RNA sequence: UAUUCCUCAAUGACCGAUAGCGUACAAGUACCGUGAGGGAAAGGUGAAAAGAACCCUAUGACGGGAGUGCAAUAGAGAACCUGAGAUCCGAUGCGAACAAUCAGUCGAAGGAGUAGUCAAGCGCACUCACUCUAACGGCGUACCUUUUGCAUGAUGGGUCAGCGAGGAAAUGGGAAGAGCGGCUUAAGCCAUUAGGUGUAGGCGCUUUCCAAAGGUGGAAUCUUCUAGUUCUUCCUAUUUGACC
RNA sequence: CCGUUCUCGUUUGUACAGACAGACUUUUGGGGUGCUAAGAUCCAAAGUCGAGAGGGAAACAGCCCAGAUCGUACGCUAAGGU
RNA sequence: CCUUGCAAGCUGCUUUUCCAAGUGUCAGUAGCGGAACGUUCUGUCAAUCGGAGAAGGUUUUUGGUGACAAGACCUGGAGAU
């Protein structure tokens, strides 16, 4: 149990519950922006987007998930920038979906040798779905009449 | 599967090995020249085992020794530890005549005589009667045992 | 490899090299070895892209690309250069920012 | 699940109780499939029967979506794997993924157009 | 190398010694100098206990 | 360069132990080298084994210098330690740019 | 229960065709109490089917297939490709290379394996309890009725084979030749195939002392 | 005891129309040769012919309707069950007469066609929705064989469908598995809805050097250890045409 | 004689092989023959191709760097470059 | 795949499985070794499927490392394992 959260954690999320039908967590488009890691890859989200990353291990559908590298924050007025992270940012995100890719081919064949080989190959990806970002200061729900 | 001796699950102790069909596709490792190599005799399929490339070979290089007797006799061994063996299994009548015969019935000798029997001296210090045989041909420490005990 | 699984891949092909076994199964290995090569050639082409438009955004305040991401390496910065090439496309003020504080890290000689 | 929403619906598990290729899903429904049905209360799981097939296990979705998977002559072990991932996915249909990052508002602050003044 | 500039059909080009040649050939100098060092300032005697 | 990284922070004396690390390719060596490598253990590139201070191995250091870089224990510590040290964590900077 | 293999004797209730109670029989450890073996039944069941096998296939070679010995044209100038006959194994209404010849496919094997597993067979039987023994299988008439309602009578049974101890008995002969699922045979017959064909073994007394005579008869060498 | 120009009965882990006899069909025919001689091709409507009366357009129905029939592209005159591919002629969508190359692969503006989900107010944004095409950019000198080495201006192939080359017996060398403890039968004999018997023989025990006569103490000291043979599968060898 | 390698890569019984047509490069600064010619030819010591893809040498068997189990629109370097 | 632990059975108390760690290994011609897919026929089979539509053919979808397998529509009209 503390050996896959401290492993998650090294890796980049933490896992905060599952989803309750009560809950209402998908707000419309705000405009700030938050640029997380997960893993060796790196993505630059909004509230609403979606990321597919790599197979996550300890997490299932529906789970709440908080990202805990943040690497820079931004909105339309200033910026915060983490030497190398954040640790005050927080993004929040739900697992979607755990999901084999299409089949690629592996092909090798050397001419006039009397040599081919032929395999296939199928990649598992982890689907998020983003919904909050916080640590910048939002701008305020504005019904501009 | 109760003690069940049904047609349809016999199997054997291990899979059974299948034959190695040379001359199939590149995948199964035996395709396009099977296992030959590339030309020559031993490709082409000609080729005597047992010659040497045109050199003079060992077997004609040897010379040729002695003569062949066609009158040569044959005669089993049998060591006097074997037969005390028997002695001491009850098997063998210490008491009465041994000949060819006891020892062809007990099992000593083997399943074709041929020429009668040779009494040999393994096993000589297991001998404590004394003994009478009637065999073919005896060695000097089998005779020096046995008359030592008091046998003939 | 199958007769009709070759012809499902050799769908789309201009001439005879869509019917006929023999000229199907030649153009369908070249494909598989071109896309095995792609896969591993991907890569280079996506980032010398990510570079390109990296130094075009930051020649506008006239710092190079050289200078600019040492810059960031010195500040301990680890914004990779698709995200960095991301920024300078999408949020141009965010990127100004990174380039004043790499120029201020790291000027260089001239 | 989608937004919060499940997609895989209905469970059909086809199986077969005299042929030999329905061993391993036929000890599979003993084993696992209550503890499946257990952990999963909004997915509803059938049970048919077809004497003389081969054993296979479908997948029906919110988006009007058949997913079918032959079982036959396989492990209870991967008829619950293969079981797992028809649960796990959203329907969607197997071709090559274009873009690992999906967004409908790219910028924030403004795409860099030529007229960009600092 | 090969050093067959003049003679054959089969072109062997000439490789130049620019100045990127040079700084790296220089870099691999300091690298061996540096072991060197290394290896003379430990070279004094044998470090005890087997 | 990539002797950047390797090249020395502390002062070089005697030490009781040595850290060796393959920076060469193996082919296009004598077999040679190849097997004095792999009997101190190395057999990949940008691998590093620990040995201790005896002329057995500086020998074979010495054989095989140009391909190695060969480092002491303080040397090895201050590099590792240097490299934490630049990958610590700072306090973040936020920067204001407004009025566009 | 009782577990199998341990060599011991099983006791067993006698009946007949008409369900009366006709006491008991002591059978023989070292014939119904054997380890069962399923690849010594495998064995034998191959040995059996493979000197079974008829092995009249025969095709045709080029000394055999109809056809002139003559060069179909010229070795070279005609432009095509060099053949010797028109009769060679790739052409249409050629020979057949490799291909098969009457034969047999007999395979050998030991006689002590042999009793091996008809001991097993017969072991297997009786711990399954699908063996019965009769006290004689006289019947009053040849009809063949008597056995179908024998049969009918009979619980949890698909086929049934009947051994007999010696010659057949004409009446026993004449009832069940049209029924394809009651068959019969003589104790010098008893095989491992046959047994295993049928869920249901009936034997008589003197099937069952012939068969563990036989047993314990070794073999004259 | 040997053989089958012949007759009767039965069987097949024998073939199933490029197979099986050269011949499933009027074949030693047609055809080729002066002659001896060589020597093919070609199976199937439908359960039953009920095989399409009659009308229209053509010189003429094999066409378009009508009717029989479960079904009519099931409509034939030594051929109509199913009806694949090369090949030929059309229709719909997109590309295509200022741009070159084993004709693809990795990205990709645009054009064209079509779906579904449901909370909120019956809209609209969600499913990277899905399918076809691809202006433009980067990269890319077929396959086999033989060779030190082939884009090679070295060999071979017009394309499609069907066919086409490590296989059988007996005896040897071994490996894996099993039976028995000495092991195992060959010809034969008695029965077959099927097995059981048969000791002649072979190997081992067993005795080691030696041309032949001749000759022959294994180990251990401490309740003693002291031998193999026969099948099955697979890889190789010899004799046979011996991968073609 | 002693360290390092923890790998048997060593010796040997049994069974199955293939191959016995090699090429180029290291100052003509290891040499013989030739004209101190050859992408000649014959030996000694290394490396690569043979049987080896990837980056540089415009293009490139044999030169320089380096050894392809698979996936990613992640990072650091070699030969060589800006 | 190997190596080392840990846990089970074994008989072998030492050879097989499960799990975890491995900055351990995985280019390949001649050649050698291991493991599998498919075709025709046979036993299981007087058993199972079939006008609730067999074999065969054209599309399309799904699974496996692969030879390949399987779901559905259209055609087809009696066999398949
Ligand atoms: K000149
Ligand atoms: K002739
Ligand atoms: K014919
Ligand atoms: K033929
Ligand atoms: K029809
Ligand atoms: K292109
Ligand atoms: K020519
Ligand atoms: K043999
Ligand atoms: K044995
Ligand atoms: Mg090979
Ligand atoms: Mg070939
Ligand atoms: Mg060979
Ligand atoms: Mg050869
Ligand atoms: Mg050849
Ligand atoms: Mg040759
Ligand atoms: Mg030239
Ligand atoms: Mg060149
Ligand atoms: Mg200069
Ligand atoms: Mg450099
Ligand atoms: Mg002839
Ligand atoms: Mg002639
Ligand atoms: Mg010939
Ligand atoms: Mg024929
Ligand atoms: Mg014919
Ligand atoms: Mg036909
Ligand atoms: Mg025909
Ligand atoms: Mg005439
Ligand atoms: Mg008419
Ligand atoms: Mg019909
Ligand atoms: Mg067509
Ligand atoms: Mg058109
Ligand atoms: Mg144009
Ligand atoms: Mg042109
Ligand atoms: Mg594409
Ligand atoms: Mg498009
Ligand atoms: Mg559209
Ligand atoms: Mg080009
Ligand atoms: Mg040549
Ligand atoms: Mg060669
Ligand atoms: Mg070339
Ligand atoms: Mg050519
Ligand atoms: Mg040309
Ligand atoms: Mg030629
Ligand atoms: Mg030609
Ligand atoms: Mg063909
Ligand atoms: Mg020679
Ligand atoms: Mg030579
Ligand atoms: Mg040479
Ligand atoms: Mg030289
Ligand atoms: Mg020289
Ligand atoms: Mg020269
Ligand atoms: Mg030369
Ligand atoms: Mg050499
Ligand atoms: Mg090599
Ligand atoms: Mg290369
Ligand atoms: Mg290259
Ligand atoms: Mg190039
Ligand atoms: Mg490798
Ligand atoms: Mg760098
Ligand atoms: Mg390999
Ligand atoms: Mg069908
Ligand atoms: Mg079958």
């Not at chain 1, 990353?53 to 920038?81: H, M, P, R, W, Y």
């Amino acid at each position: 149990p503390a050996e896959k959260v401290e492993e998650a954690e090294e890796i980049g999320y933490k896992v905060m519950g599952p989803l309750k039908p009560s809950e209402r967590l998908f707000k419309p488009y705000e405009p700030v922006f938050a640029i997380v890691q997960i893993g060796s890859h790196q993505f630059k989200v909004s509230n609403g987007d979606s990321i597919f990353t790599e197979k996550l291990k300890f997490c299932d559908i529906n789970d709440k998930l908080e990202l805990t590298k943040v690497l820079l924050l931004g909105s339309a007025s200033q910026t915060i920038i983490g030497r190398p992270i954040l640790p005050d940012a927080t993004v929040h995100a739900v697992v979607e979906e755990h999901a084999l890719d299409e089949k690629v081919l592996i092909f090798k064949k050397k001419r006039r040798k009397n040599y081919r080989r032929t395999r296939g190959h199928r990649q598992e990806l982890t689907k998020l779905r983003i919904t909050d970002i916080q640590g910048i200061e939002k701008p305020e729900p504005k019904i501009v009449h | 599967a109760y003690s069940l001796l049904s047609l349809n699950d016999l199997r054997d102790n291990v899979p059974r090995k299948l034959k190695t069909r040379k001359g199939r596709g590149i995948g199964s490792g035996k395709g396009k020249t099977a296992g030959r190599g590339h030309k020559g005799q031993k490709a082409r399929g000609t080729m005597k085992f047992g010659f040497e490339g045109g050199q003079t070979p060992l077997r004609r290089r040897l010379p040729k020794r002695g003569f062949k007797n066609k009158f040569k006799l044959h005669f089993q061994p049998v060591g006097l530890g074997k037969i005390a063996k028997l002695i001491n299994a009850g098997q063998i009548d210490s008491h009465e005549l041994i000949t060819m015969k006891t020892l062809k019935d007990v099992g000593a000798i083997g399943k074709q005589i041929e020429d009668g029997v040779r009494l040999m001296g393994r096993g000589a210090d297991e001998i404590k009667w004394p003994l009478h045989f009637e065999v073919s041909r005896v060695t000097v420490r089998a005779k020096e045992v046995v008359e030592a005990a008091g046998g003939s | 490899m199958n007769k009709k699984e070759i012809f499902k891949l050799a769908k789309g092909f201009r001439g005879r090299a869509k019917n006929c076994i023999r000229i199907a199964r030649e153009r369908v290995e070249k494909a598989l070895q071109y896309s095995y090569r792609d896969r591993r050639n991907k890569k280079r082409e996506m980032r010398g892209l990510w570079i390109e438009r990296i130094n075009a955004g930051s020649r506008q305040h006239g710092v190079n690309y050289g200078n600019f991401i040492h810059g960031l390496m010195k500040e301990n910065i680890q914004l990779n250069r698709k995200v960095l090439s991301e920024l300078s496309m999408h949020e141009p003020y965010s990127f100004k920012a990174l380039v004043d504080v790499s120029r201020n890290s790291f000027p260089g000689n001239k | 699940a989608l937004r919060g929403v499940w997609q895989l619906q209905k469970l059909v598990v086809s199986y077969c109780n005299w042929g030999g290729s329905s061993r391993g899903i036929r000890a599979f429904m003993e084993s696992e499939l209550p503890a499946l049905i257990e952990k999963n209360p909004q997915l509803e799981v059938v049970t048919e029967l077809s004497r003389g097939q081969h054993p296979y296990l479908k997948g029906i979705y919110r988006n009007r979506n058949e997913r079918v998977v032959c079982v036959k002559n396989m492990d209870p072990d991967q008829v619950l794997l293969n079981a797992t991932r028809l649960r796990n996915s959203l329907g969607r249909k197997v071709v090559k993924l274009r873009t690992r990052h999906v967004t409908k508002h790219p910028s924030v602050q403004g795409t860099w157009t030529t007229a960009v003044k600092f | 190398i090969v050093k067959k500039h003049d003679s054959g059909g089969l072109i062997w080009k000439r490789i130049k010694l620019t100045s990127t040649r040079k700084a790296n050939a220089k870099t691999r100098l300091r690298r061996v100098w540096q072991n060197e060092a290394v290896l003379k300032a430990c070279g004094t005697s044998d470090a005890a206990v087997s | 360069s990539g002797f950047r990284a390797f090249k020395a922070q502390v002062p070089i004396q005697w030490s009781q132990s040595l850290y060796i690390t393959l920076v060469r390719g193996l082919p296009g060596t004598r077999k040679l080298h190849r097997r004095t490598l792999e009997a101190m253990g190395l057999r990949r590139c940008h691998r590093t084994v620990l040995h201790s201070n005896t002329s057995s191995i500086r020998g074979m250091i010495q054989q095989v210098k140009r391909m190695v870089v060969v480092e002491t224990e303080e040397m090895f510590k201050a590099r590792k330690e240097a490299e934490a040290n630049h990958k610590a964590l700072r306090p973040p900077l936020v920067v204001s740019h407004s009025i566009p | 229960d009782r577990t199998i293999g341990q060599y011991q004797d099983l006791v067993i209730p006698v009946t007949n065709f008409q369900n009366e109670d006709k006491g008991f029989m002591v059978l023989a450890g070292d014939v119904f109490d054997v380890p069962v073996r399923k690849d010594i039944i495998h064995h034998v069941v191959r040995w059996q089917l493979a000197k079974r096998q008829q092995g009249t296939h025969s095709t045709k070679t080029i000394s055999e297939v109809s056809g002139t010995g003559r060069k179909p044209w010229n070795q070279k100038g005609t432009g095509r490709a060099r053949h010797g006959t028109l009769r060679g194994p790739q052409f249409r209404g050629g020979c057949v290379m490799h291909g098969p010849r009457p034969r047999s496919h007999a395979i050998k094997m030991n006689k002590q394996v042999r009793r091996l597993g008809l001991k097993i067979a017969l072991t297997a039987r009786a711990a399954e309890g699908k063996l019965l023994v009769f006290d004689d299988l006289a019947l009053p008439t040849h009809k063949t009725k008597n056995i179908v309602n024998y049969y009918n009578q009979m619980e949890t049974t698909k086929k049934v084979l009947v051994v007999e101890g010696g010659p057949i008995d004409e009446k026993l002969k004449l009832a069940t030749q049209n029924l394809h699922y009651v068959n019969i045979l003589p104790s010098i017959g008893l095989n491992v195939y046959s047994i295993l064909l049928h869920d249901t073994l009936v034997m008589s007394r003197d099937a069952v002392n012939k068969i563990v005579e036989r047993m314990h008869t070794p073999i004259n060498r």
